[PDB]
Amino acid sequence: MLQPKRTKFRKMHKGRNRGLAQGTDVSFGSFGLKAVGRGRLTARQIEAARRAMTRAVKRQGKIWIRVFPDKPITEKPLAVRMGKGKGNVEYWVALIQPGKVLYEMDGVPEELAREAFKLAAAKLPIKTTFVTKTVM
Amino acid sequence: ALNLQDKQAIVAEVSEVAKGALSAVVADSRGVTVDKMTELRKAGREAGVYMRVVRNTLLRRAVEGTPFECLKDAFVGPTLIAYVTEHPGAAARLFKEFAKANAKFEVKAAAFEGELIPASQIDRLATLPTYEEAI
Amino acid sequence: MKVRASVKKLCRNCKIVKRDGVIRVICSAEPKHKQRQG
Amino acid sequence: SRVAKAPVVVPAGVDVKINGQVITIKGKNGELTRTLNDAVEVKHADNTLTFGPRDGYADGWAQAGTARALLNSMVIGVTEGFTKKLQLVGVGYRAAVKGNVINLSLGFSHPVDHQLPAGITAECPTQTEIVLKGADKQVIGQVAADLRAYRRPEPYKGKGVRYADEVVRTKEAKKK
Amino acid sequence: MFTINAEVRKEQGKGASRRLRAANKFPAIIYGGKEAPLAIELDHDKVMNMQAKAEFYSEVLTIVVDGKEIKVKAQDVQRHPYKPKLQHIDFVRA
Amino acid sequence: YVKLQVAAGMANPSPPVGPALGQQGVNIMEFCKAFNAKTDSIEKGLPIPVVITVYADRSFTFVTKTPPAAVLLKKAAGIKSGSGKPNKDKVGKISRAQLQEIAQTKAADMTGADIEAMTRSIEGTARSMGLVVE
RNA sequence: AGCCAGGAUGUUGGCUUAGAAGCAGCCAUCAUUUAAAGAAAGCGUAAUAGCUCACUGGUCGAGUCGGCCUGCGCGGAAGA
RNA sequence: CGAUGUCGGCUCAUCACAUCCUGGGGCUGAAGUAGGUCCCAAGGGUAUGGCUGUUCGCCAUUUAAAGUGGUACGCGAGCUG
Ligand SMILES: [Mg+2]
Ligand SMILES: [Mg+2]
Ligand SMILES: [Mg+2]
Ligand SMILES: [Mg+2]
Ligand SMILES: [Mg+2]
Ligand SMILES: [Mg+2]
Ligand SMILES: [Mg+2]
Ligand SMILES: [Mg+2]
Ligand SMILES: [Mg+2]
Ligand SMILES: [Mg+2]
Ligand SMILES: [Mg+2]
Ligand SMILES: [Zn+2]
Numbered sequence: 001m002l003q004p005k006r007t008k009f010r011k012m013h014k015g016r017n018r019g020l021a022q023g024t025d026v027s028f029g030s031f032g033l034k035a036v037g038r039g040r041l042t043a044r045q046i047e048a049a050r051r052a053m054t055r056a057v058k059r060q061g062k063i064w065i066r067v068f069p070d071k072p073i074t075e076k077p078l079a080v081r082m083g084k085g086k087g088n089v090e091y092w093v094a095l096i097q098p099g100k101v102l103y104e105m106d107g108v109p110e111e112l113a114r115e116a117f118k119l120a121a122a123k124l125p126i127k128t129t130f131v132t133k134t135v136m
Numbered sequence: 137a138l139n140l141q142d143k144q145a146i147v148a149e150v151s152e153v154a155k156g157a158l159s160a161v162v163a164d165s166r167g168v169t170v171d172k173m174t175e176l177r178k179a180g181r182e183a184g185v186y187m188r189v190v191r192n193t194l195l196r197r198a199v200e201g202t203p204f205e206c207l208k209d210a211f212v213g214p215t216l217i218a219y220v221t222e223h224p225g226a227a228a229r230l231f232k233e234f235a236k237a238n239a240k241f242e243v244k245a246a247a248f249e250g251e252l253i254p255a256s257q258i259d260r261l262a263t264l265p266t267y268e269e270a271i
Numbered sequence: 272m273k274v275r276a277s278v279k280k281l282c283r284n285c286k287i288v289k290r291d292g293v294i295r296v297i298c299s300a301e302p303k304h305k306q307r308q309g
Numbered sequence: 310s311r312v313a314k315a316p317v318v319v320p321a322g323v324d325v326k327i328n329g330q331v332i333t334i335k336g337k338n339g340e341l342t343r344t345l346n347d348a349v350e351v352k353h354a355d356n357t358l359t360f361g362p363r364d365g366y367a368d369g370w371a372q373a374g375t376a377r378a379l380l381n382s383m384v385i386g387v388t389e390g391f392t393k394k395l396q397l398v399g400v401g402y403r404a405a406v407k408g409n410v411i412n413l414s415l416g417f418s419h420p421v422d423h424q425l426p427a428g429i430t431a432e433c434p435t436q437t438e439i440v441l442k443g444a445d446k447q448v449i450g451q452v453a454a455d456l457r458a459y460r461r462p463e464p465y466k467g468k469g470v471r472y473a474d475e476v477v478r479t480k481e482a483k484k485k
Numbered sequence: 486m487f488t489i490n491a492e493v494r495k496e497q498g499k500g501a502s503r504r505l506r507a508a509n510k511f512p513a514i515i516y517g518g519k520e521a522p523l524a525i526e527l528d529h530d531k532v533m534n535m536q537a538k539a540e541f542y543s544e545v546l547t548i549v550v551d552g553k554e555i556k557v558k559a560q561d562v563q564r565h566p567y568k569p570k571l572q573h574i575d576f577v578r579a
Numbered sequence: 580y581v582k583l584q585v586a587a588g589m590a591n592p593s594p595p596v597g598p599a600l601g602q603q604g605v606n607i608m609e610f611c612k613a614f615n616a617k618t619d620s621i622e623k624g625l626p627i628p629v630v631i632t633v634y635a636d637r638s639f640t641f642v643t644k645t646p647p648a649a650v651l652l653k654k655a656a657g658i659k660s661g662s663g664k665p666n667k668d669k670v671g672k673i674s675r676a677q678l679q680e681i682a683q684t685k686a687a688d689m690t691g692a693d694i695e696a697m698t699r700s701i702e703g704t705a706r707s708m709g710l711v712v713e
Numbered sequence: 714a715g716c717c718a719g720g721a722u723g724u725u726g727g728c729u730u731a732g733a734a735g736c737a738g739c740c741a742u743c744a745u746u747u748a749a750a751g752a753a754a755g756c757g758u759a760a761u762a763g764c765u766c767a768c769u770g771g772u773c774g775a776g777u778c779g780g781c782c783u784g785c786g787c788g789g790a791a792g793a
Numbered sequence: 794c795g796a797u798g799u800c801g802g803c804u805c806a807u808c809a810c811a812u813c814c815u816g817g818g819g820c821u822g823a824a825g826u827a828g829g830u831c832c833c834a835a836g837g838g839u840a841u842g843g844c845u846g847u848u849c850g851c852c853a854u855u856u857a858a859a860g861u862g863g864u865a866c867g868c869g870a871g872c873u874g
Contacts, residue, residue: 020566036567099566129567135542136562170721174690174746181692189748189770214771272819274832276789294788303820308788465824482824648723663728665741690722690746700723703743708727
C-alpha cells in the first residue's frame with residue numbers, strides 16, 4: 001500500500017482538482033491504463049487494482065504505477081462537533097485529472113494486457129481507457 | 137482460410153501433375169471414414185497413384201490447361217482425384233474394388249487420351265493389365 | 272432465473288434476447304445460465 | 310428480407326383469393342385464412358406469390374418476411390398437411406382417442422380429457438403414442454404444447470409427455 | 486507516399502482553433518528553412534488514418550496547400566488527452 | 580469391442596485383463612491360451628497390443644499388433660520407467676541406428692510412406708517421455 | 714448463417730493411481746496419413762465406450778463480420 | 794423557551810413493502826417429504842406466558858405464521874404513571 005516515507009507537513013488544505021493531466025503518454029511500457037474521469041485514487045484502490053492485474057499476467061512481464069498517493073486526507077469521527085482543530089490523517093489519495101496514465105505494462109501480448117487492465121479497472125472509482133505506446 | 141497465394145499454389149501443384157500423369161480417375165468420397173482412406177492412400181502410393189481432394193472450383197482451373205477439359209461436368213459434388221504418374225491404369229482398378237467393398241459413393245468419371253468416359257463405361261481402364269504384358 | 276444489472280453471455284449456447292424491453296440471457300445447454308436484467 | 314424476397318410457388322389444385330390484406334388458401338387438405346399486416350403488400354401473378362414492403366411503413370421487410378413464411382406453411386398446410394407426434398414415458402401412462410377427445414391417464418386422481426379444436430385430428434397407433442394431423446402449423450403446434458403441458462418431461466427419469474423428436478436430458482439426484 | 490491536402494488558415498488563436506476541431510478539422514504548422522512559417526488546417530478523419538501507420542513519422546510526406554506541393558517530415562504531434570484524436574501537428578520542411 | 584495390452588507370455592491374472600474384458604461376454608480360458616500360443620515368437624518382457632472383435636453369439640476374433648512406440652523406447656535406452664517431467668528431466672539416450680530399429684518393426688501399424696516418415700513418428704514419442712536423441 | 718460428410722494414425726503420449734485410454738492432476742505438446750482433425754474446447758464412464766466442437770471437402774448463391782468517432786433512447790430504479 | 798408534556802404499557806389504529814404465513818413462478822449442490830435462493834404478489838391473516846419500568850432480549854409452550862418499517866420513536870383536551 002503506497003504512502004510517502006516522510007513529509008514536510010502532516011495535514012494538507014483541501015484544494016481543488018481542476019485542469020488536464022500531465023503525463024499522458026505510455027513512457028516506460030508498451031501498454032497503459034489512462035484516466036478518462038476526474039477524481040481521487042486512494043492507496044487501497046491503487047493496491048486493489050495492482051493486485052488484480054498482477055494475478056492476471058501470472059507475474060510475467062513488468063508493471064509500473066505512474067501515480068503516487070502523496071495527498072493526506074483528514075476525517076472527523078462520530079459524535080464530534082465542528083471546529084476544535086483539523087481532523088486526523090486517515091488515508092492518502094492521488095489527485096487524478098483526465099488523461100493520466102495510471103498503470104503501464106510490457107512483456108505480455110496485447111490480448112492479455114487488455115484483460116489484465118479490464119480486471120483492474122473494476123477496482124477503480126474513475127473511468128479508464130486502454131492506451132498503446134506511440135511513435136512521438 | 138485459403139489465401140489466393142495458397143489457391144494459386146494448389147492450382148499449380150495439380151496443373152504440373154496433370155501434364156505428367158497418364159490415367160486420371162475422378163470420384164465421390166462422402167461418408168467414408170479416414171481409416172478406409174489412409175488405407176486407399178497406402179494402396180495408391182504403392183501403385184504410383186497420386187491421391188488428392190481439391191475444391192471443384194480450383195479443379196476447373198488446373199484442368200483448363202488441357203487435356204482433361206472434359207472432366208468439367210465431373211466437378212459437382214465431393215471430388216477425389218487419382219492421377220496415375222507411373223503406368224496407365226492402376227487407380228481405375230484400385231477404385232472399382234474399393235467402391236464395391238465399401239458400398240459408399242458411386243465414382244463420377246474416368247479420363248484417358250484427352251477423352252471423356254461415362255460412369256457406365258469405366259470397365260475400359262479396369263480390364264487393362266501391365267506394361268509389362270506385351271512380352 | 273438470475274435477476275441482476277449486468278446480464279452477460281456465459282457459454283457459447285447463451286443467446287441475448289429482448290422480450291418486452293427486458294434484456295434476457297436465454298440458454299439451451301445450461302438452465303443455470305438463464306438471466307433477466309433487473 | 311432474404312425470406313420475403315424468396316417466392317411461394319402455389320401448386321396445381323391450390324386456389325388463392327386476395328381481398329386487400331385478407332388471404333384465403335383452398336386446397337385438398339382444407340381451407341385457411343389469414344389477415345396480413347398493413348405494412349405487407351402481396352402480389353399474385355403466375356403460379357407464384359411475391360411479398361414486399363408498403364411505402365411509408367418502417368418495419369416493412371420484417372413484416373413482409375413473416376407474411377411469406379406464414380403463407381408458405383399455409384400452402385403446405387392445404388396440400389401435404391402437418392404432423393406432430395408425442396410419446397408418453399412412465400409407468401401407468403396411457404392415452405386413447407374417442408373422436409375429437411384425447412383421453413390421457415397421467416398419474417392424476419382424475420383422467421385428463423383434452424378436446425381438440427377445428428381442423429386438428431388425432432390417432433393412437435399405441436397406448437403410448439399420440440399423432441396429430443391438420444392444416445394450420447400454428448394450431449397443431451399449440452395442441453401439441455397443451456398436451457405436453459399436462460406432464461412436462463421430468464429431469465430425473467424423463468417421465469412425461471414428450472415430442473417424438475424431443476431430447477430429454479436427465480440428471481442424478483443429490484449425493485447424500 | 487503520403488499525400489495530405491490542406492488550406493491556409495484565415496484566422497489564428499484559441500476561439501478559431503476550437504472552432505476547427507468542432508468542425509472535424511485541426512490546425513497544424515509548417516516551418517523550417519528561409520521560408521516564413523505556414524499556418525494550415527487539416528481534415529481530421531483523413532490525417533488520423535494516415536498517422537496510424539508508423540511510416541508516417543519516418544518518411545517524407547507531401548502537403549498540397551492550394552495547388553502547391555510542399556515536402557515535409559512530421560516533427561511534433563499534439564494528441565487529445567484521452568480520446569483517439571489529434572489536436573495539432575508540427576511539420577518541418579524537408 | 581475393446582482394446583488391451585497384455586504381456587508376450589502372460590495372460591490370465593484378475594487385476595489387468597480379468598473383469599475388464601470378461602464383463603462384455605468373452606471366455607476367460609479360451610482367449611488366455613490362444614493368445615500366448617501365437618505370441619510365443621515375441622521376445623520375453625515386451626508388452627504386445629491386441630484388439631478384440633466380439634459378435635452377438637459371444638464368439639471372438641483377434642488380430643495381434645506390433646509393440647507400442649512408448650514401450651520399445653524403454654528397452655532401447657535401458658530404462659524401466661519414463662520421466663515424470665519430460666524435456667525437463669533426461670532419463671536416457673538413443674542413437675539414430677536405434678530409431679530406425681523401432682520404426683522397421685512398427686512398419687505394419689504406421690501410417691508413413693517412407694523410412695524417414697516412420698522415424699520422425701518415433702522421434703516425437705521419445706521427446707514426450709524425457710528421452711533425448713544422442 | 715443453415716444443411717450433407719469426415720473429425721484419423723503412432724497412441725491407452727509419459728509420469729501418477731485400484732483406474733487416468735483427449736477429458737482428477739502434473740509435465741511435454743511433436744510427428745504421420747492429410748481436404749482437414751488440438752497428443753484435444755465441453756458434457757459423459759469405475760476406467761473404456763458414446764455425443765459434439767476447433768478445422769476441412771460438398772451444397773447454396775450474394776453479401777457478411779466487429780472495432781472506431783458520434784446523436785437520441787433502454788435496463789440499473791423499493792416507502793410510508 | 795409570553796410552554797410543541799418525556800419512556801414503556803392499555804385502548805384504538807392507518808399506511809409502505811425491503812413479504813413472516815397463505816397464493817403463483819424460475820434456478821437448485823430440487824428423487825419423494827422437506828429445504829435453499831431469487832422473481833411476482835400487500836387480499837386477508839400474523840401467540841399466550843415466566844423475568845424485568847422496559848421497548849428489546851433471554852427463556853417456556855404454542856401457531857400456517859408469531860414479518861420489517863412510516864404515522865410528533867402514531868395515540869395523556871383518551872386512560873395509566
Ligand atoms: Mg410477457
Ligand atoms: Mg474564450
Ligand atoms: Mg458455411
Ligand atoms: Mg402562545
Ligand atoms: Mg416486492
Ligand atoms: Mg443474494
Ligand atoms: Mg397486511
Ligand atoms: Mg407467579
Ligand atoms: Mg415457527
Ligand atoms: Mg410517540
Ligand atoms: Mg387526564
Ligand atoms: Zn449458457
